[PDB]
Amino acid sequence: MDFDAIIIGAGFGGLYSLKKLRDDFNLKVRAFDRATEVGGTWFWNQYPGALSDSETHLYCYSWDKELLQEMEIKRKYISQPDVLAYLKRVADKHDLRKDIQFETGIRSAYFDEENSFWNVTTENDEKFTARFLITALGLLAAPNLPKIKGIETFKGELHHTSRWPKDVTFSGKRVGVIGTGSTGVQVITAIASQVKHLTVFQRSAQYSVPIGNVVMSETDVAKIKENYDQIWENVWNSALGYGLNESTLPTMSVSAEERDKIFEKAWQEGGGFRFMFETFGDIAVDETANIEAQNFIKKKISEIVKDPFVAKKLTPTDLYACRPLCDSGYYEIFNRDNVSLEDVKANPIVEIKEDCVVTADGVEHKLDMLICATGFDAVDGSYKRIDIRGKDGISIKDHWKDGPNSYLGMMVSNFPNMFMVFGPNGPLANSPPIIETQVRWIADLIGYAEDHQINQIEATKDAVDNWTNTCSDIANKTLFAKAKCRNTVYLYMGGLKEYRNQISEVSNNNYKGCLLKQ
Ligand SMILES: Cc1cc2nc3c(=O)[nH]c(=O)nc-3n(C[C@H](O)[C@H](O)[C@H](O)COP(=O)(O)OP(=O)(O)OC[C@H]3O[C@@H](n4cnc5c(N)ncnc54)[C@H](O)[C@@H]3O)c2cc1C
Ligand SMILES: NC(=O)C1=CN([C@@H]2O[C@H](COP(=O)(O)OP(=O)(O)OC[C@H]3O[C@@H](n4cnc5c(N)ncnc54)[C@H](OP(=O)(O)O)[C@@H]3O)[C@@H](O)[C@H]2O)C=CC1
């Protein structure tokens, strides 16, 4: 009797969840977040070089036409402080904070089968009740780097990229970075010119393409805002929602000289998804096609990195091109006299002293600062860190013991009245379009519940297994069977448009696979 819905999360997913349910469906709803301000991961992740993978004019909401026309499009891609300022504007305009309880982590969510609602308890023993639970948790857990003996003995600055403190200075300091993923590449490229010396501890070299983050002219921004309606229709009609001309052309169907200029054109425009999916249509499907994309980036590495032994060290061994990163000058950094690259697969880290990282060759790497760009736990980690218990009292820890399974990426069997926003078993595409799709869909169902006097919604065990069927069927058709994440399937790989088709069919067929109770 407290609320119609409780929302966990104050980022992209939770913000739109609260706006949709409160202002478009007149529900009484409260949102909770451990943060002190809106933003989600854009409020937490403030490491150097933090940048969006998707272009500025698309990494935003589409449901507010006035916001689209007044939005600031400063550069082709948007930095973390600017995303945070955008989400704070969204909360300002739509009067959202008055229904968000900040500095409040939820500890447990217990489904009350008798009354058909959720018992939600914060970490300060505050207990709320609500008919529906909206979980917009994102992806977060941060595996710091234990496994390395003696990391707790380090006397210098030790930061994980997810907990990046304020007022970090780099001048005159010897800095080390562990991790060469998307975050590591961004930090390394941003700080190398600022430090006295940078040591990169690379376990696995990955492919990276230029992002081409350039300033946007008054004319560039005007052409976007004049054609914004068509731009978003292309997003809903695409597989990735990145504004790309998604290619159908086979990689080997063109000559070697034509293939080189197609890759070169995308290399100049910039963009990771552009290089994989705007160039040709079978790079993630055919091995001969994939190797062609590998050899182009491998050739680009050996031209940029003048030292052939450093270039060889940066070249991915046998890793096939599956999600290459984007960078703003990552390969050029290793030409600097103050940058050292350490292959910690052939020369592993064995211990950390009070003042250094020591490798297996005995070399002590003196450091004033050690940055851990080591990553984040699995996508179900944010859910397992919650004490959620549905029917018969089973917890999501037990139910997802062997990975996350769901119906349409939004519903979990044995967990009624719980709807996941940007959760696992979802599509691989631009996140704001995915979040908007799922939030509009979930709100449509809850409105269908208030109209039809329904107080319990639950997915069946077989609709979930049917979802695992279509995800595994599409996934096993693509090259994503070597170094990724994902018989539990983690992602639906049919694209955004087919995901919206799939989810529209069951909303048009009386929510097939859902157990509606009155
Ligand atoms: C630097 C960066 C750049 C990215 N760029 C792109 C891009 O270009 N394109 C793209 O498609 N994706 C991108 N992503 C990924 C994706 O867009 C983000 O994960 C996205 O912000 C997800 O939004 P969200 O609201 O669902 O989750 P989040 O933004 O992570 O918000 C989740 C919130 O829930 C809160 N929360 C969780 N559990 C609890 C609890 N128990 N109690 C209280 N609060 C809780 C957290 O504190 C957090 O504030 C990027 C991610 C990062 C980190
Ligand atoms: N817009 C963007 O481009 C961004 C996207 N993201 C998203 O966030 C997710 C996380 O990105 P990231 O933060 O890079 O997390 P990642 O897991 O992608 O990067 C992990 C890095 O840490 C290294 N590592 C982990 N453990 C060790 C160890 N014990 N010793 C040495 N090296 C180690 C890994 O090496 P190995 O590979 O050998 O395990 C890898 O290089 C990505 O999936 C990405 O999609 C986040 C920020 C920016």
Q: How many domains does the chain have?
A: 3
Both tokens of 136, joined, read: 């917009």
CATH of the domain at 361: 3.50.50.60
Best mutation site among 12, 431, 496 for ligand 1 pocket (most ligand atoms within 8 Å of CB): 431
DSSP-derived letter for residue 365 is E
Q: Quick check: is 83 in a domain?
A: no
Q: Are residues 354 and 333 in the same domain?
A: yes
Q: Are residues 202 and 284 in the same domain?
A: no
SS3 state of residue 184: helix
What is d(CA 136, CA 151) in angstroms, rounded to the nearest whole number? 33
Both tokens of 350, joined, read: 């064995």
For residue 179, how far is its CA from the centre of ligand 2 (angstroms)?
Answer: 6
Tally DSSP H helices, then E strands, for the chain: 17, 24
User: Torsion over CA of 297, 303, 304 and 306, rounded to 10 degrees?
Assistant: 140
Q: Are residues 193 and 331 in the same domain?
A: yes
Task: State the method.
Answer: X-ray
For residue 9, how far is its CA from the centre of ligand 1 (angstroms)?
Answer: 9
What is d(CA 386, CA 368) in angstroms, rounded to the nearest whole number? 36
- The string of DSSP codes covering 399-451 is HTTTS---BTTTB-TT-TTEEESS-SSEESS-HHHHHHHHHHHHHHHHHHHHH
Q: Quick check: is 445 in a domain?
A: yes
Best mutation site among 137, 420, 436 for ligand 1 pocket (most ligand atoms within 8 Å of CB): 137
Report the DSSP beta bridge partners of residue 8: 32, 135
DSSP-derived letter for residue 215 is B
Q: Are residues 505 and 439 in the same domain?
A: yes
Range of the domain at 310: 238-318
Residue finishing a domain among 292, 318, 344: 318
| Amino acid symbol at 236 | W
Both tokens of 3, joined, read: 């609320």
What is d(CA 166, CA 158) in angstroms, rounded to the nearest whole number? 13
Whether 424 lines ligand 1, by a CB cut-off of 6 Å, is: no
H or E element, residue 230:
helix 228-236
Question: What residues does ligand 2 touch, defined as CB less than 6 Å away?
Answer: 51-53, 145, 147, 178-184, 186, 203-204, 325-326, 344, 373-376
For residue 364, how far is its CA from the centre of ligand 1 (angstroms)?
Answer: 37
Could you tell me the resolution of this structure in angstroms?
Answer: 2.1
Residue finishing a domain among 375, 399, 418: 375
Both tokens of 514, joined, read: 């859902």
Beta strands in 290-348 (DSSP E): 325-327, 339-343
- Packed helices 287-304 and 256-269: angle between N→C axes, nearest 10 degrees: 60
Whether 179 lines ligand 1, by a CB cut-off of 6 Å, is: no
Instruction: Identify the CA nearest to 44 among candidates 146, 139, 194, 162.
Output: 162
By the 8 A CB rule, do 266 and 245 touch?
no
Q: Quick check: is 223 in a domain?
A: no
Q: Are residues 200 and 137 in the same domain?
A: no
Q: Are residues 305 and 253 in the same domain?
A: yes
Query: What separation in angstroms does the CA of 266 have from each of 212, 296, 305, 510?
Result: 10, 11, 20, 44
Whether 45 lines ligand 1, by a CB cut-off of 6 Å, is: yes
Q: Quick check: is 506 in a domain?
A: yes
What is d(CA 7, CA 269) in angstroms, rounded to the nearest whole number? 39
Q: Are residues 442 and 462 in the same domain?
A: yes
DSSP-derived letter for residue 482 is S
What is d(CA 464, CA 466) in angstroms, rounded to the nearest whole number? 5
Q: Given the CA of residue 375, which atom of ligand 2 is nearest to it? A: 15
For residue 338, how far is its CA from the centre of ligand 2 (angstroms)?
Answer: 23
Among the bound ligands, the one closest to the CA of 60: 1
Q: Are residues 261 and 408 in the same domain?
A: no
Both tokens of 212, joined, read: 């081409």
SS3 state of residue 157: strand
Beta 106-112 vs 117-122: how paired, if at all?
antiparallel
Whether 427 lines ligand 1, by a CB cut-off of 6 Å, is: no
Residue finishing a domain among 334, 358, 375: 375
Q: Quick check: is 79 in a domain?
A: no
DSSP-derived letter for residue 152 is G
> Which pairs with CB-CB distance under 8 Å and at least 24 residues apart come from 374-378?
374/142, 374/143, 374/144, 374/145, 374/160, 374/178, 374/179, 375/142, 375/143, 375/179, 375/181, 375/183, 376/139, 376/140, 376/141, 376/142, 376/143, 376/162, 377/141, 377/142, 377/143, 378/141, 378/403, 378/485
Strands laid side by side in the 369-372 sheet = 157-160, 369-372, 174-178, 197-202, 339-343
Q: Quick check: is 66 in a domain?
A: no
- The string of DSSP codes covering 218-229 is HHHHHHHHHTHH
What is d(CA 350, CA 386) in angstroms, rounded to the nearest whole number? 34
DSSP-derived letter for residue 97 is G
Nearest CA to ligand 2 atom 47: 183
Q: Are residues 422 and 313 in the same domain?
A: no
For residue 298, how far is its CA from the centre of ligand 1 (angstroms)?
Answer: 32
DSSP-derived letter for residue 378 is -
Q: Are residues 412 and 460 in the same domain?
A: yes
SS3 state of residue 300: helix
Report the DSSP beta bridge partners of residue 106: 122
Q: Are residues 419 and 485 in the same domain?
A: yes
For residue 319, how far is its CA from the centre of ligand 2 (angstroms)?
Answer: 15
| Amino acid symbol at 256 | A
What is d(CA 259, CA 280) in angstroms, rounded to the nearest whole number? 9
By the 8 A CB rule, do 307 and 333 touch?
no
Beta 369-372 vs 157-160: how paired, if at all?
parallel
The contacts of residue 431 (CB under 8 Å, 6+ apart) are 12, 422
Burial class (CB in 10 A: 0-12, 13-18, 19+), 324: buried
Both tokens of 487, joined, read: 């018989």
Both tokens of 152, joined, read: 């707790």
Q: Quick check: is 342 in a domain?
A: yes
Q: Are residues 353 and 490 in the same domain?
A: no
Q: Quick check: is 51 in a domain?
A: no
